[PDB]
Amino acid sequence: VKANMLRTFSSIPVSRICKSPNERARLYFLLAWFHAIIQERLRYAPLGW
Hints:
By secondary structure, the protein is mainly alpha-helical. Helix content is 65%, strand content 0%. Helix 1 crosses helix 3 (24-40). This is Cytoplasmic dynein 1 heavy chain 1.
């Protein structure tokens, strides 16, 4: 999950994720965490998705 979130944070430009209402950053962090969780869950095929 750590590597996935680090990968999905460098992909998103800083300009979009920062220069906005100050609550956007927490929303993007939640989005990255959710994407990492559901992407890492795919490894355990029959028990996950």
